[PDB]
Write a protein that binds this ligand. Structure first.
Ligand SMILES: CC(=O)SCCNC(=O)CCNC(=O)[C@H](O)C(C)(C)COP(=O)(O)OP(=O)(O)OC[C@H]1O[C@@H](n2cnc3c(N)ncnc32)[C@H](O)[C@@H]1OP(=O)(O)O
Ligand SMILES: [Zn+2]
Ligand SMILES: [Zn+2]
Ligand SMILES: [Zn+2]
Ligand SMILES: [Zn+2]
Lengths: 72, 97, 498, 540, 93
């Protein structure tokens, strides 16, 4: 919706990734983390909650390219 | 103009007699105050004495080892210093004096 | 997975998310994918700080961080100094052996190094600064946990660890040699090698599982420095970090079942080698994992046993902390109660016939010779026990109201099942100091005036002391002497006051 | 002083915190005791380290491999000795106590003849490799380098253990060259002192080096010395300080090393508050070396233990107004400053900058202890003076401030027959050809396919990693052995004395052996005599 | 069994013989070790004369004398370490 990336299509394409790519997404996001974004991690159970509307545009571009490359 | 050599070998001239006399005193104390009535006490004192003996023996041997190593390193250092002086003699020009 | 409605959720299999090989593999491909012009300006933490320092000093850098680092090179940046003519200080002579033409790092293959560095970043961060269990920034520390055995202990006060360790937020520490790293992978690799499971020094007391090893101060200069640095994380005021030669460290370990025995560090206390202040203990510590279990009082009673074997009077260093004072109070109280009860029980044997009129009075010096503390500690104990009375001739008098209260105190304190010292299970002998006082340092004509020395002492005999029997080597043999000293005295009649 | 620390009341020599005084002088009060607890003081993780380990075994060759399984405890199941029998053998009266000489090999693994021959062959590689054990810990970025090497040179056969062993070999071989470097003689001493004099003339210095033919004190700028507090010289650098000034309380026999040269290495660091890299440096309560003069003169900074001058505490306590200022000599924008003492003047500067320029600085009449106490912050202050407000006799030092500016501009511009260079501009090692030779020999010993370029690559990598670390050795081993500054005849007399003491130690050893024999004999005698004398009294 | 009795007694006698021989050997060896001093100072010319246990800075050329052959009986620190020895010493004196 905002920025050079459409959040709806980004989240949609996020669904087709497999488990290893999902773990990679979690690692990529966990590495570069800022005070503004709203990320929650639960290590025992293994839960990871994130809201796209809070992330900056850099990580958005990075995730866009990551999923675009690894979907095909 | 240098201090007395006695302070250089401080790990062999001073710290060896301290621990040696300490261990021997402990052994004498054990032997003297061992009472012959209790078989468990006597059996314990046996291995206490044996252990203290082995300890003092190894404590003596380690210093011989360290001293041999030190002598070797000393002669190597002498050769190195001689060669270094001989070498640096030729480059007297570069050093501004 | 359930990305619907503006929010995403994912499941890990954390035992696979935390793997090593997968971490490295994923980081390798993640590093170049994220735009490399994704950077901040403010924070300078360990990894990026090191990388930027190296880039600046190699000049293969790029102006991204406005904060400058100035000192880089010597003013005499010249390739004609005399050093290059005499290579390696002369310890090599063959011409074809100090040749450094095939091993100088090239500007070409500095870049592969920097590439590996900047590719390992995500793996380094996940391995270092992410906790496994669930629960201007350059001046204060960032440590938040300490992984000692398998726990994650929280610290109380900062400690002067090295800087690249204080910049992270998890420091891993081996509990067998006390070494500290800042990466779980590194820790795994190091535990793969550390094979000995016993601290240095000799062991003196062994009862059941608890053992106490004695470590000198000049033969193990690394172990002791690491131990001081660790203990400073909990002790508030300990200012002996580096020069650790004058001290002697007693250490408490618990043994359990490669399958051979392993001795887990659990606590320690430190004792100065020589001093003239009637001191007994410089610092003491039990790990937060297992305290409130008796180990502190065990170590205290052990120290007092050592002092009584040395035939002196002792007391701990005076700037007491609160958590230590709250323990020393109880210890003094219980020791005074126990010595009073033992005195009663001993007098009850031969006091079967005499009347209650004869009051056998005792003194602080006798109580001290019996227990081990100094008179002021004895009187603090009696105070806590509520036995002293300065009634309105004799001024002060100890008086017991009822014989059940004291034995009640004793039995309720004993029912906790704490471990205690057994006199016969020790193997030790008081230390003897030669002309250098056990250290490898300062020597002059001052110690001879300090002696109340010139290289004439050299521990001359120290072995003819059996001829005199005034001193007693057996504590349970000197106690009967102290018990019969003043207790055969003609007792005061009881008709003084009622 | 709390009441539980005191001596006695009126007299008794004959037959919830309370403090009697204040810290020094006061009356009795009370205080509720705070033995705090965050309710989460510790937690136990669920998954151990060996749980999340690798899955593939990168070994493919077993050519003389027991040398690895001797030192590394790779995940094999050895002789499964039951914990009950281990308790029987390690907790019985038959089990003696331990000592610092107990053979560090545990009887669970017995060394075979093949293993001992292998370790002998390894030790035979070079005289500096006897008594060898691996000591390196692979990083998490060495993994990529290992991958690259295994893909390019060694045909996918190198292993983590081999990499670590090579690294420690390089470390040991460099240390045994490091220890023997001749320290100093007359020629290089004269060169050093002349160079330092010329330096001080050109730019001026704050360490005291170069004021005259004699050195000075980097902390108090003194020149005299007594027998209670001498003037000791550091060896990493060449600074000179007194004991009661630098907090020296333990003078070692051999080489003394400053705190920086002991903990870190001479790599040119900077204060957290002053932009320089030379002088006497002290540690704060976190790391972050700080000038032992910047800390003294900055008000909010104070020392913790007045006898040792140990950790510089109270650094975050300084306000934010100080960082707003900026020195007028150097004109950078990092660190702290102090204002001129005269009123209406508002020209700040760092203290090393003020010293190097040559402004007026005076400690007054207080002592070093009083100045480091933090209690003289309430007493009258030290006196630093601006350039134009200098007192009588102290000239206008525009020349000095231009000298300082010239030094700093030169530093910034430097920032922007046969000779074989053997160390980087940061004085870090550079591996020579013999090291590559030893590495090729070791690879041959292990049996891999060695091309002569892999050794050079590994040497370059070692040098670059040691440059990355900063100067601190990768492996932690270090000994106080310092032959160094010894002359020749000194070494000769030392050798003679060593020979005498060794000849004596031999007789000592013989006496000790006889002592042990006597002990054993008496023990056996008592052992037999007890039964031989109880059997007669007990008919049975 | 008288057979076992005598079998014990013979080995007992041999053991006490060996013990006495060891005691005497230790005694004489330590006497020679403490007395060897004077020969080096009286006959390279390693002027360092003096043992390691009883030796002090006379084990250095800072002093020069020929009374180094003086030593009492309270220095037998290797034979004193037994109980039989000190008990016999106190008995005979
Ligand atoms: C300078 C010097 O010489 S002393 C400085 C010592 N100060 C420090 O070490 C600071 C950190 N302190 C410690 O690490 C340790 O607490 C120690 C050694 C002081 C003692 O702690 P512990 O191991 O648990 O001692 P211990 O096993 O015997 O405790 C038993 C009794 O001591 C007293 N007590 C001990 N700790 C507490 C406490 N936190 N709160 C209340 N009472 C306590 C109680 O009587 C307690 O009985 P309880 O179980 O009913 O509560
Ligand atoms: Zn370890
Ligand atoms: Zn000074
Ligand atoms: Zn230094
Ligand atoms: Zn400045």
């Amino acid at each position: 919706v905002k920025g050079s990336v459409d959040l709806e299509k980004l989240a949609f394409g996020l669904t087709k990734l497999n488990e290893d790519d999902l773990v990679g997404v979690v690692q990529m996001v966990t590495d570069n983390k800022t005070p503004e974004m709203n990320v929650t991690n639960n290590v025992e159970e293994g839960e990871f909650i994130i809201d796209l509307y809070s992330l900056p545009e850099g990580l958005l571009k990075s995730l866009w390219d990551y999923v675009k490359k690894n979907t095909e | 103009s240098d201090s007395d050599i006695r302070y250089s070998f401080l790990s062999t001239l001073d710290h060896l007699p301290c621990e040696l006399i300490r261990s021997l005193r402990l052994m004498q104390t054990i032997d003297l105050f061992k009472n012959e009535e209790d078989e468990p006490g006597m059996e314990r004192a046996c291995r206490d004495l044996l252990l203290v003996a082995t300890y003092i023996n190894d404590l003596v041997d380690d210093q011989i080892h360290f001293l041999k190593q030190h002598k070797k390193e000393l002669e190597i250092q002498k050769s190195v210093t001689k060669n270094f002086n001989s070498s640096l003699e030729n480059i007297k020009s570069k050093l501004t004096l | 997975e359930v990305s619907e409605e503006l929010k995403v959720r994912i499941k890990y299999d954390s035992i696979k998310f935390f793997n090593f090989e997968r971490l490295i593999s994923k980081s390798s491909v993640i590093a170049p994918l994220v735009n490399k012009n994704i950077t901040s300006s403010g924070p300078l933490i360990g990894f990026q700080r090191r990388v930027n320092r190296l880039k600046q000093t190699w000049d293969l850098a790029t102006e991204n961080m406005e904060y400058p680092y100035s000192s880089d090179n010597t003013p005499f940046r010249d390739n004609d100094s005399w050093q290059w003519y005499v290579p390696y200080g002369g310890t090599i002579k063959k011409m074809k052996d100090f040749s450094t033409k095939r091993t100088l790092p090239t500007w070409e293959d500095k870049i592969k190094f920097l590439t590996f560095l900047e590719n390992s970043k995500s793996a380094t961060y996940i391995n270092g600064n992410v906790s496994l269990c669930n629960h201007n920034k350059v001046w204060f520390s960032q440590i938040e946990y300490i992984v000692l055995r398998n726990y994650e202990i929280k610290p109380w006060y900062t400690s002067p660890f090295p800087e690249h360790i204080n910049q992270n937020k998890m420091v891993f520490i081996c509990e067998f040699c006390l070494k500290y790293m800042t990466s779980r992978y590194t820790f795994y690799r190091h535990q793969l090698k550390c094979l000995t499971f016993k601290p240095p020094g000799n062991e003196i007391y062994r009862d059941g599982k608890l053992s106490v090893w004695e470590i000198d101060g000049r033969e193990n200069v690394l172990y002791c420095q690491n131990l001081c640095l660790l203990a400073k994380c909990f002790i508030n005021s300990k200012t002996l970090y580096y020069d650790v030669e004058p001290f002697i460290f007693y250490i408490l370990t618990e043994r359990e079942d490669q399958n051979a025995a392993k001795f887990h560090f659990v606590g320690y206390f430190s004792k100065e080698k020589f001093n003239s202040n009637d001191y007994n203990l410089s610092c003491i510590l039990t790990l937060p994992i297992y305290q409130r279990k008796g180990y502190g009082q065990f170590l205290m009673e052990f120290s007092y046993l050592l002092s009584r074997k040395e035939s002196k009077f002792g007391t701990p260093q005076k700037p007491l902390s609160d958590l230590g004072l709250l323990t020393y109070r109880t210890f003094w109280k219980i020791k005074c109660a126990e010595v009073l009860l033992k005195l009663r029980d001993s007098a009850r044997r031969r006091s079967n016939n005499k009347n209650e009129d004869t009051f056998q009075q005792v003194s602080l010096n006798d109580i001290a010779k019996l227990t081990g503390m100094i008179p002021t500690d004895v009187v603090f104990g009696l105070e806590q026990l509520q036995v002293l009375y300065r009634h309105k001739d004799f001024n002060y008098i100890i008086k017991i109201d009822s014989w059940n209260r004291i034995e009640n105190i004793y039995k309720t304190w004993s029912s906790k099942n704490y471990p205690r010292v057994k006199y016969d299970k020790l193997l030790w002998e008081p230390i003897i100091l030669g002309p250098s006082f056990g250290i490898n340092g300062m020597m002059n004509l001052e110690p001879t005036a300090l002696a109340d020395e010139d290289t004439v002492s050299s521990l001359t005999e120290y072995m003819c002391d059996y001829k005199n029997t005034n001193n007693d080597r057996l504590i349970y043999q000197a106690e009967k002497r102290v018990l019969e000293s003043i207790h055969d005295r003609k007792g005061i009649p009881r008709s003084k006051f009622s | 002083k709390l009441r539980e620390e005191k001596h006695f009341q009126d007299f008794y020599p004959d037959l919830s915190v309370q403090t009697k005084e204040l810290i020094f002088k006061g009356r009795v009060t009370t205080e509720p005791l705070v033995l705090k607890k965050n309710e989460v003081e510790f937690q136990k993780c669920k998954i151990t380290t060996n749980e999340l380990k690798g899955k593939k075994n990168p070994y493919c060759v077993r050519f003389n491999e027991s040398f690895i399984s001797r030192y590394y405890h790779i995940n094999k199941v050895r002789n499964r000795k039951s914990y009950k029998q281990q308790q029987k053998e390690f907790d019985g009266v038959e089990a003696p106590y331990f000592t610092k000489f107990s053979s560090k090999e545990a009887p669970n693994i017995t060394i075979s003849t093949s293993t001992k021959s292998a370790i002998q062959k390894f030790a035979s590689i070079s005289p500096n490799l006897v008594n060898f054990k691996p000591q390196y810990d692979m990083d998490e970025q060495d993994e990529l380098y290992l991958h690259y090497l295994n893909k390019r040179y060694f045909k996918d056969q190198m292993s983590h253990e081999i990499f670590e062993i090579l690294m420690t070999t390089l470390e040991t071989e460099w240390f045994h060259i490091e220890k023997h470097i001749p320290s100093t003689n007359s020629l290089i001493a004269r060169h050093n002192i002349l160079r330092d004099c010329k330096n001080y003339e050109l730019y001026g210095s704050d360490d005291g080096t170069g004021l005259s033919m004699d050195q000075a004190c980097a902390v108090c700028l003194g020149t005299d010395s007594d027998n209670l507090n001498t003037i000791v010289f550091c060896d990493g650098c060449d600074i000179a300080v007194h004991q009661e000034c630098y907090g020296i309380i333990f003078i070692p026999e051999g080489k003394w090393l400053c705190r920086r040269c002991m903990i870190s290495k001479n790599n040119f660091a900077t204060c957290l508050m002053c932009p320089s890299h030379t002088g006497a440096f002290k540690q704060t309560d976190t790391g972050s070396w700080v000038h032992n003069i910047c800390a003294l003169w900055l008000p909010e900074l104070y020392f913790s233990n007045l006898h040792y001058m140990e950790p510089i505490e109270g650094v975050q306590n300084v306000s934010v107004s100080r960082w707003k200022l900026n020195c007028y000599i150097c004109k950078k924008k990092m660190g702290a400053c102090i204002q001129c003492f005269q009123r209406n003047c508002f020209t700040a500067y760092h203290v090393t900058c003020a010293r190097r320029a040559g402004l007026y600085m005076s400690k007054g009449k207080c002592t070093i202890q009083e100045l480091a106490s933090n209690q003289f912050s309430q007493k009258y202050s030290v006196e630093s003076f601006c350039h134009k407000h200098a007192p009588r006799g102290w000239q206008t030092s525009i020349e000095g401030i231009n000298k300082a500016r010239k030094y700093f501009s030169l530093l910034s511009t430097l920032q922007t027959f046969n000779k074989t260079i053997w160390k980087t501009p940061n004085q870090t090692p550079v591996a020579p050809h013999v090291f590559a030779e030893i590495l090729q020999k070791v690879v041959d010993f292990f049996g891999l396919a060695n091309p002569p370029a892999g050794a050079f690559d590994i040497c370059k990598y070692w040098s670059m990693k040691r440059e990355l670390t900063g100067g601190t050795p990768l492996t932690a081993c270090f000994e106080n052995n310092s032959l160094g500054s010894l002359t020749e005849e000194q070494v000769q007399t030392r050798i003679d004395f060593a020979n005498d003491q060794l000849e004596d130690l031999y007789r000592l050893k013989e006496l000790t052996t006889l002592v042990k024999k006597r002990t054993q004999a008496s023990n056996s005698l008592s052992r037999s005599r007890k039964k031989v004398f109880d059997i007669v009294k007990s008919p049975q | 069994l008288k057979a076992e009795l005598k079998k014990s007694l013979q080995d007992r006698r041999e053991q006490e013989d060996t013990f006495d021989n060891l005691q005497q050997e230790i005694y004489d060896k330590e006497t020679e070790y403490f007395s060897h001093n004077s020969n080096n100072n009286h006959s390279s010319k390693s002027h360092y004369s003096g043992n390691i246990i009883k030796g002090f800075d006379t084990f250095s050329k800072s002093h020069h004398s020929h009374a180094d052959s003086a030593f009492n009986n309270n220095d037998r620190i290797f034979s004193l370490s037994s109980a039989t020895y000190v008990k016999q010493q106190h008995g005979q004196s």
